[PDB]
Design an enzyme around this catalytic site. Sequence first.
Site, short mmCIF file in Angstrom:
data_model
loop_
_atom_site.label_atom_id
_atom_site.label_comp_id
_atom_site.label_asym_id
_atom_site.label_seq_id
_atom_site.Cartn_x
_atom_site.Cartn_y
_atom_site.Cartn_z
N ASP A 190 28.95 -23.34 20.96
CA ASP A 190 29.89 -22.26 20.72
C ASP A 190 30.00 -21.96 19.23
O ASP A 190 30.11 -22.88 18.41
CB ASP A 190 31.25 -22.64 21.32
CG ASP A 190 32.33 -21.61 21.03
OD1 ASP A 190 32.25 -20.48 21.55
OD2 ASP A 190 33.29 -21.96 20.32
N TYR A 194 28.48 -19.65 12.59
CA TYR A 194 29.38 -19.84 11.48
C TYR A 194 29.20 -21.17 10.78
O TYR A 194 29.79 -21.38 9.72
CB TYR A 194 30.82 -19.70 11.97
CG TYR A 194 31.09 -18.33 12.55
CD1 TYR A 194 31.35 -17.24 11.72
CD2 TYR A 194 31.06 -18.13 13.92
CE1 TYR A 194 31.60 -16.00 12.26
CE2 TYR A 194 31.31 -16.88 14.46
CZ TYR A 194 31.58 -15.82 13.62
OH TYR A 194 31.83 -14.59 14.17
N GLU A 231 25.01 -20.00 21.82
CA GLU A 231 25.59 -18.71 22.17
C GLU A 231 25.98 -17.95 20.91
O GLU A 231 26.83 -18.39 20.13
CB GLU A 231 26.78 -18.87 23.13
CG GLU A 231 28.07 -19.37 22.54
CD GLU A 231 29.04 -18.24 22.27
OE1 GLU A 231 29.05 -17.28 23.06
OE2 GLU A 231 29.76 -18.30 21.25
#
Lengths: 439, 439, 441
Positions: A190, A194, A231
């Site tokens: 997930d 970032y 993802e």
Amino acid sequence: MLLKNAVQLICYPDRIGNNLTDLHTAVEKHLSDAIGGLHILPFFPSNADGGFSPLTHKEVDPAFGTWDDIEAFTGKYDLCVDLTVNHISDESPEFRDFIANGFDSEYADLFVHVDRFGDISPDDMAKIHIRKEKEPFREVTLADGTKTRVWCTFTEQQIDLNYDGDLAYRLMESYIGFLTSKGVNLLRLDAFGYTTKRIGTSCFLVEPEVYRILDWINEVAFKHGAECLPEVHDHTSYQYAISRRNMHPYGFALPPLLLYSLLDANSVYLKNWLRMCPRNMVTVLDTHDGICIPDVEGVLPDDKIKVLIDNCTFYDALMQNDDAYIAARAIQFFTPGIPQVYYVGLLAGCINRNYYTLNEMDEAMEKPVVQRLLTLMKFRTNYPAFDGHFELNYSNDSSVAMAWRHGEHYCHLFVDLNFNTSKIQYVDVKSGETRDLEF
Amino acid sequence: MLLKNAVQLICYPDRIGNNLTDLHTAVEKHLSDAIGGLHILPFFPSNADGGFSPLTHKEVDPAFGTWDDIEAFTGKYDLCVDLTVNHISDESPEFRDFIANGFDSEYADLFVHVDRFGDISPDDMAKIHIRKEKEPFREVTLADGTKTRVWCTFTEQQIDLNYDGDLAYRLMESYIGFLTSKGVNLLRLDAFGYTTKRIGTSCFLVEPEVYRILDWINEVAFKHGAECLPEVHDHTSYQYAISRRNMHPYGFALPPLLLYSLLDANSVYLKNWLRMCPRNMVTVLDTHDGICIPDVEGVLPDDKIKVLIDNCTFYDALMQNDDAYIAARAIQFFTPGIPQVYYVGLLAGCINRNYYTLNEMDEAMEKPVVQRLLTLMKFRTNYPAFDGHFELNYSNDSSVAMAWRHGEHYCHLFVDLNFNTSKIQYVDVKSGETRDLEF
Amino acid sequence: MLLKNAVQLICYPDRIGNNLTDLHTAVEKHLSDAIGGLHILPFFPSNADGGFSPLTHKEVDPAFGTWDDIEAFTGKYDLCVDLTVNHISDESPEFRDFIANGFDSEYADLFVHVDRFGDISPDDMAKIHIRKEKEPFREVTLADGTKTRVWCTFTEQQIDLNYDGDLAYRLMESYIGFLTSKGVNLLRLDAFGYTTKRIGTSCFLVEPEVYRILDWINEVAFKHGAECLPEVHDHTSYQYAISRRNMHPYGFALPPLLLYSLLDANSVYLKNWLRMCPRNMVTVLDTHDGICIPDVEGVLPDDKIKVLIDNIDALTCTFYDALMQNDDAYIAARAIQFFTPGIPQVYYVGLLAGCNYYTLNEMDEAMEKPVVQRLLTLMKFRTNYPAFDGHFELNYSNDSSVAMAWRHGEHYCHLFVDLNFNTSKIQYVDVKSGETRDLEF
């Protein structure tokens, strides 16, 4: 390879019945030979963001059940689980220790300290790829009474991990080892984009840093018997980059692509994508998150996207038309990759996150459209041709013709987008004749 | 694998000097350590279409030289040669025998007889994907005085081969065996999409027929020591389909993509493509045919294509700007795949098919922009990092950062599209220091 | 046989008062000199689509009244009535007999059997002009217990007739005879375009079959004293083809054209359309269906259609509502409609300024509304002033106004609409005094 080439169920721990035991009851009663795996949405102790702020990946939130309730699945079904690689809860043991002991804490280098970077120019802030409209910096009060700032991409109860340091990789390997020991086959990574923070950059998918981070996790996963599902919602180019590092991309292009295809009775862009589609992908139609548009840029021209936008559980976008919905699942299932079916999509529900009791699911299973969907799911999960090779067939620009072949086993999908008709022909090996799937 | 990962020269047999011997003189004098192979454009006996109507693939047109002039290359350089799989000359031995002996000829089933299909409805004619605006049917007078019609996609001196029958595959295997015995590594399959003829279809890229035809040829090629380069100008989706069957696609998306990138100082679409680009492709910038637009659909949005169209040797589209041209070759060369350089592009020429004498090439080699291009070609052909792995780097939306890595060997391209600057840094292994390529 | 060049009322049988008699009372009380005819919406035994699935065209539903209640209108009024030429009820005697006796029934060739063709290719299915998203095929269970498929364009209770066979023409000539015996002047041909079924084609407006079927129906009407109003929603070109076979097309281009004109204060496209408009059309403003876009393509440019569409989705929109319930704008549109060549119809809800069922007292209230009195003044003028019986002469105007005129000897009337201020001015020649006077509305 490692995973079963079968339909998977995306579901919460507590929204079919009340917990993982009720969940297990539902699968066995209805789906026992229709799915080969489950993606159970976050089921760890969490304190924000619907479960994506886990205190640890080493505990089941007792509200949902226990690890024994998890392992009840991991002898018969593949198990896909979220790994929040970007961040962990501020209530985690590691972060509370940093709060207590300041920079003397041995977990201090697990987090990103905004002060290392120095003064960040406006131009460098303007490069950062973030949705929230606050600076991604949380100023925290330490135990001593000092105030320091840590990087925070999401809600303030989510503290980002530091992948320039070392502790972040240890923490993840610990999570992966323990999760894999519990029977988890597949790690949905997930918010992986970032994890790359570098001033002067987008701090999102920073290349090639992002792939070294991504390669490392995949190897840790492979040692422990698991594969990865990274993802990211962005240009499909990242999905092919993921696919080419022996990981599973999402087929996030498919849902909006089918919506356009069905609403405007047009297969040109769908066929072009199927001819190109990244392989070893996990396909969805409806997710736990919903509509994402940048995933179909390039796959669908800007004018057709506008058509799509101008014209949300996936069932509602097709105007609750069963034939259209069944044809879309049919198309999804013959698309290369492992097909996931979100539980609300299984029950033809009508914002994308509903609760069902065990009686309500049994009733929803009786719906004609749901029986048609079970028939597909069992066929896609069991018929051997899907284990062979994909061969797309010629069709006109208003229809789609898709086939799979594995030795004798052969099945052929034909969807007329003008009339939302679904026809599957398959080879019954035992009799050697060609049969029509009744759905 | 089988081919050298090095720059290749696209050239005619007779347009540098007068023939293959003059051609061989030019390569050795100037390009001996700058290229690892050649694509020699059709050099067989032909009677139309600039060489793509070969009487046979088993003869060198004596105008250009002999097979010994060919083999002079096939001990030091890879050799790419056209295989006209769709059609052969009406003056070929096989077709003249069909003319003489009618349907009693043993080569009759080598060609496509329009009469087998019966009456072809207007709707079925409207499906056919063809550029010419005549029906693709040539009515021929036989020796006896009868008139029969054969399929003809191109000029009337080109008769299409029949891939529902058997002789067509034998004829091709004969050509491939003999061509490969002469030292040919790589078969450019010309007009492969038209080999699939089926009424009711596009008669172009008819799936999955096209891939079975394509798989068969590749296996024949592999037995005889050669790889394939199937050339089709259509949606890039076919390039990925080609790539996924262990064949070499063309990077036909790249040239118009770089034109847009350079003219509008924009790397967003270029970087997205590099992140996705089909692998094991052969890259070109200028071809022997010229500008093709449908090869960049989807790769470049329709609005940016219009910009490109609104704003031809590749050098002229960059307005004869050397810095822009050198940067484009730099970008091409770091793009995954085998880079081809068309000979007019080597000599910075100014419609896409010029003649040079051996003196004129020596003069053109002295041009500053051409020396910059030789430096790249030698570097791309020799520096070991290109044999490793491609890692695209983060850049702003007006620049491109491309790197290769193979053990110690590492080189990094940076192009600023605003100022057309080309900077290459590479690792000199012997000294272990980082050096600037001077070009 | 020639119709009255006067306003017609489109109305249900049972939604003014309680039945056709109350309708007749209401007509005489208020509209006796304002309309010359009525289009009474379906009043037959039906079981779907609001009345357009008739068991027969030979019965009135006893709730609405009787056939004698209908003939009460004929004698002072023209009568327009629907003829569903495409399909009949599955509960009709003819199809119910098909249920019992299978293909041995003598009504078998009255319907279209999807299996005649054999396999229909996807390319041929994709050709079919059909609006629903199921195949136009109903599979029925026979009396024998076997399953056969008949063509079914609309809801499954509506079974399409076979116009390759003969029975459909007899069935249709039969309906036309009965309707005309009750006094029906005008047959609205419902869903006339799907009568042509041919694999390899659109199976809708298939040329030239469609005009032969249309010519044949027109002839049967002529034997029995009736004219035809063939209703099709497609490119206006089909409206002129109908017009040139001595039949009445609908002016479906006008409503969307006037909406734009009033909303954008632009008369260019309206004036161009009036100069071309097909002859002998029946004009409406609001239908029982709503606003349809393919009826205005070409008549109005794609940029101007988008402008209109943008306004209105901000089409199930009663024309009064599309004008923002602006009385002046609505009157100006009805005036323009009335001076448009053709026979003007006024839907009853538009007559009563609604935004429905009404009682007889409620209509008296609606007649008292100032906007309805203005509409009555127009209707009486259009129905009675002789100039409309002559020839149409469009006038030069600027691009924000419309100037329309009629002339019949001394009789002359002139409409001027300022689209900027929704002003409606009619001046006409009072023949007896020879002076020019203003209609007060």
